[model samples]
Target: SGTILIDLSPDDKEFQSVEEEMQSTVREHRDGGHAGGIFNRYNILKIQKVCNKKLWERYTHRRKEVSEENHNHANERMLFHGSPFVNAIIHKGFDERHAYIGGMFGAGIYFAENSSKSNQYVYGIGGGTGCPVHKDRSCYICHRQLLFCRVTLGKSFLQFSMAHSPPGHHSVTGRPSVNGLALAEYVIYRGEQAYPEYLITYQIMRPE
Candidate 1:
């Protein structure tokens, strides 16, 4: 197999360090030291759905432009099919804590890009979570968080190929259903009341 999978058991001493790193990254990006506020105030699942729809629409509308500029130039497919704006949204139903934790990591990256300070770098925000391997519904929370990021960015399909774990893993791999898609649908149907400001920003970045 070309894949190298490493197992970091929850009980492993490294778990503490990893968890701390994740929490710290979230704190750095969130408005305050508390990350729970972000989740409580923003329905992450709904946000992700909005992000996904916007990304897809942008990708569809700009496909020709993107293909001509990037794909034609490189002789390969352009990720997002050529759109520059990307969306990423994490589901709340999966595991609020894990999604919140992962979103903080993803948000850190987003913040870094917008951050005034240079030479500042953040890492360790996304991974599989919930259940561990050898058990259904098990995953690293970071992976799920990253999946949310990837999906919003029009990289969901690509993320499935590149990340340690793929989106729809539970769905395709026969794990217990987390109904992430349903949560996404709810957000799509209902719109963003969870975090109205963030939704507005997301739309501005990737307008449909």
Candidate 2:
């Protein structure tokens, strides 16, 4: 299938509003995977610290008398379905590294789930706000440098990569280089899936 690019700049008023709503949801989730109890308050404070420390402190102190126990069911509902945590994490720029780590952890946790003799291959695809560079430097470099590191750290039974540049961005022409193909081939052989086609503009080469 041909690559589908979607613009996600915050400059667009509608997109900006959506971004705000998404961030709000993310803040709620990052505090606690599930809300309720002091943990929820702590999480809210943590988010406020990231956004506004003073307000967080004031709110934390002011709401101390509130019954954390009473909200258990409500918090549970919010934690599980009230807000979209995954979407928020993606928006906040933690998705790539988190996904890679999570995938590794999940593979280990469910190793017996697959009886295949061959190792499993994991791939990450970013669309719209998918590029790592724009999100987090650690994650961006992790994807860029993992291939080189994998040569010596190849004990794992899984391999993964972040293929494709952000929409309308040129990875091969100059500054924004898409390192997906190189990373993929370096870690996993041609036996794995093809390099992401979304980055054709980067002229990303396949493994030799």
Candidate 3:
């Protein structure tokens, strides 16, 4: 095997940059133990802690409705089972869509990840709507699916890049330049008895 000592893929260079940036953002800010672990963590077996406790403070929700009351019950349920966590059933009633299991591509077109944080929930890719699987957020379970993704810091809370160079549609190489973007942020409502939230950003009226 006479392999040269070159460690780079010129062909995949541009797209590669997009993928690399994705992982860093999601890992460090999204889940690198940076969050107070409110919706993510906090419980009895472990010990109660404020979401805004110095190093831990900056990362929490800071909303009592969610920071404490909501987080309190959530941590307990996780103590036992997971995945099929019966959030919807336990709270209000149930919705047929609650059992959604499909490709998440279409879901993005309807994703409300950019709306006000009234009702939000993060959904991962599954049979209903395979999604999340973001590489930047260490959510690359999407494997090599064509996608539009990002984790932006300046603009909106849904700050993230999204290059929709889906296969067949338009390969990354096909693009001479970047295209208009579609952004969204996912969240879950604990006060609402475990409801999935979406905040899709719509078109603007006229540029100011």
Candidate 4:
């Protein structure tokens, strides 16, 4: 009926695994793909596992339905979403009804392939503004949360303008163009079509 977050330690194998992936992903996107080199400004710290039974069930159900309909594996993709409401999402899961309606891909749960692109929406620990604990610290310790999600992108429709829905596709992917998107974006209309699998806590490190 709800969700649970397991705090993973650096010593944990799963933690190290995800940390490695995130680090490599940030590096890969910075040097290649649609992001150019903008993903070099952040450092990944920790990743927590999100264990939500109902959400997982719904996600798997949809995945199966999409796979059966298309004779494929639903084109599952690991994506990133940055947000300040870490606690709310950890407990209640993602809700499409609360999604911003006027996005480039219309009203949907937006996710990015590049860490830097998702980092645009990240906020500090306290009220998404500033961390009280960060004060009086050396070099300003700012911590933010990023969601690593599993998205079912069965036959994604690529576009550069606003779309009310994906039509025959399961999701919408924004095309890279002028005033469109610098990196790829995945938009899902239904909440259950994607599952937040991990909560990545990272720090923004400014170049000295």
Candidate 5:
């Protein structure tokens, strides 16, 4: 099977449910007080279902391998990664080589449980049209995209600073309050350990 993207129907159950989940996730994390004020300034508009057959197969196989070796369910989680080249990412899959280096926690792919935390990177495309927080109209940015990913954490290592995974650890958990970051982020060194499941496209709305 080849990689294919299925634009989820807005009225579909999956679409509605996922949208609802993200709406709340974004809301809760926005008020979490970490990403400042520009975090929840956008509203989710739609979701695209990403189906990369090759990546999904690899992800499943890796999950099984890690689970058997660690005696856990691979510590699988649905996390968020905000980016711009989402279509490219969906086809090529998540590669640490392509991920931004010098991240607080090494050069691995970054994921966040908090939507606001993920939104921090949503502007990666470019500066936006007027920041809602700053009230400055310096950038033209109206839309943003966020990736809802399925990650296999396996055996995880918790850290507060830049770190490399030790033997048997499949992922890094970067906790908050260490480097002025208010939300926790998960990082995985292996690209195959994750699958970008949904692309959440949203519009940034100014306050009334």
Candidate 6:
């Protein structure tokens, strides 16, 4: 719960200890997945339009990046094409707790010190990401605004990170996923927000 996917070194034994202990933590939830509204769950737009607009926007970009070579299954194509946030759940997104761990880690969210980027990181994490066969692989992936700090270096970009594991169970075989975990902050520039615009950013982080 207190580890970062990006800051781990090969010699960071503390992380190993932390990870081993995390199983008990992860066990606190159901075994399948947490399919909350805009979280890692199933929902249609008719439900009060309860969706993460910003999150939906980003997931759409990912859908565009896919090809038959990448998503060969018909279900896979449908999941990516229509999913708003569940894009992380098996069919569309991840569970709740796993995503929380990775998000908190990169946000430096639970750290005692170094909180300069805390606001942006907190803005990304809240609900949670869970798992079914979550331990298959580990990897890290970062885009300009995908996982990062919005107010980074006074640039108001984006920042963050999370763990990506490949599928091992066929229960939800049509979802998009990667193997391995990641921690990364890029120097790229994305859109910017100001005083009141910052409030809108805060809104995006807060799930409906």
User: Which residue ranges in model 3 land beyond 4 Å of their true spot?
Assistant: 1-11, 28-146, 149-208
**Tens-place lDDT digits, model 4, residues 44-108:** 67788999898898889989988886677699988888765656776787788877666667778
Q: Write the per-residue lDDT of candidate 5 for residues 69-141, one digit (tens) a residue.
A: 7786699999988765566778888877776676777768888887756765654522333344553322224
**Which RMSD values do the candidates have, in order?**
19.1, 22.4, 22.9, 5.0, 4.2, 20.3
lDDT, candidate 6, 89-176, per-residue tens: 2122222233234332221112111111121232133212311233211101111011111221121123232232122211111111
User: Which has the greatest TM-score?
Assistant: 5
Reference-based lDDT, each prediction: 0.21, 0.20, 0.22, 0.70, 0.72, 0.21
Which is superior by lDDT, 2 or 6?
Answer: 6
CA lDDT of 7 in candidate 4? Answer: 90
Of candidates 5 and 4, the better by lDDT: 5
Per-residue lDDT tens digits of candidate 1, residues 61-125?
44333235443331111101001122222222112122222331221122111110100111222
Q: In what order do the candidates fall by TM-score, top score first?
A: 5, 4, 1, 6, 3, 2
Order the candidates by lDDT, highest first — what do you get?
A: 5, 4, 3, 6, 1, 2
Question: Which has the higher TM-score value, candidate number 3 or candidate number 5?
Answer: 5
TM-score of the candidate numbered 3?
0.19
State the TM-score for model 4: 0.80
- Which run of 10 residues does model 1 get worst, by summed lDDT? 182-191
Q: Which 10 consecutive positions of candidate 2 have the poorest summed lDDT?
A: 144-153
Q: lDDT per residue, candidate 2, 36-115, as tens digits?
A: 10111111101110222333343233233222422411111000111112223212311222222333222111111111
